[PDB]
Ligand binder design. Structure first.
Ligand SMILES: *CCOCCOc1cc(C(F)(F)F)cc(C(F)(F)F)c1
Ligand SMILES: CC(=O)Nc1nnc(S(N)(=O)=O)s1
Ligand SMILES: [Zn+2]
Length: 256
């Protein structure tokens, strides 16, 4: 699978059939239609800089990975009775500056999107057990708005020199990805899926209502990454965002 025209989102179904399921992400959040739910506590993020393990190039994107064998870095709060464990964060972008984000709000597409992934440390014992589970994963989504260079991006953008080709991997230590979040964690939540394959309808989505800034050049650093393996040609990572999906009667809750 991939984001190319011959293996993209459109051919995913004729491959993974859940892509035409009932709980697909990303989606468009129509604000006139959200619901303030009163049982929604705020969201508390308690990450530890020293769980920061490595950065690695997975060919369609890159990931920053964390140590996930105790609740050292947790997502607590929101719609969650349980504490969720941080294990990864990563990004999404597009061909140009006007649509790299996966979620849209009110039909407004953003330049990129930040995803911060947790699994249910406390109902399940492993993340492979957790992946298929409707209540297994929790991802925070942060819209990215083209403007000023983000300072806290740099410390990770500075690290892609060392993972330029597909499979290339580098150590990445002392990082609090909470530093990447907006000042307000006012958010929406809806039940949804993973946005690329395996596409598991197992993600409880947290979408911060506040954007963060990324600069036009920082987005270019995203596309200086290579889909290919070393020695092979250069094919750069141009986009890796899925089109929005049908809500199919799902309810998007606001925390405000
Ligand atoms: C850059 C890659 O991220 C780290 C690996 O995260 C996952 C592992 C697994 C598996 F069960 F195979 F270990 C599954 C998932 C999934 F649920 F598909 F997101 C992520
Ligand atoms: C290993 C891994 O993380 N696979 C994913 N598949 N879809 C994801 S999404 N866009 O929720 O963040 S992550
Ligand atoms: Zn993602």
């Amino acid at each position: 699978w991939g984001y190319d025209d011959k293996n993209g989102p459109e051919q995913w179904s004729k491959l993974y059939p859940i892509a035409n399921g009932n709980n697909q992400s990303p989606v468009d959040i129509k604000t006139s239609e959200t619901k303030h739910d009163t049982s929604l506590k705020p969201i508390s993020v308690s990450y530890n800089p020293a769980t920061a393990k490595e950065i690695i190039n997975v060919g369609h994107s890159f990931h920053v990975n964390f140590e996930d064998n105790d609740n050292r870095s947790v997502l607590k709060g929101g719609p969650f009775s349980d504490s969720y464990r941080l294990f990864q964060f990563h990004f999404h972008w597009g061909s140009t500056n006007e649509h790299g984000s996966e979620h849209t709000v009110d039909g407004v597409k953003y330049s990129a999107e930040l995803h911060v992934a947790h699994w249910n440390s406390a109902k399940y014992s492993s993340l492979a057990e957790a992946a298929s589970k409707a209540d297994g994963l929790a991802v925070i989504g942060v819209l990215m708005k083209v403007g000023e260079a983000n300072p806290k991006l740099q410390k990770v953008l500075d690290a892609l020199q060392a993972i330029k080709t597909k499979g290339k991997r580098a150590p990445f230590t002392n990082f609090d990805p909470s530093t990447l979040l907006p000042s307000s964690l006012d958010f929406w939540t809806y039940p949804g899926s993973l946005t690329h394959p395996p596409l598991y309808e197992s993600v409880t989505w947290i979408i911060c209502k506040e954007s963060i800034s990324v600069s036009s050049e920082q987005l270019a650093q995203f596309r200086s990454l290579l889909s290919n393996v070393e020695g092979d040609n250069a094919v750069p990572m141009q986009h890796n965002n899925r089109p929005t999906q049908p809500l199919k009667g799902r309810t998007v809750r606001a925390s405000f």
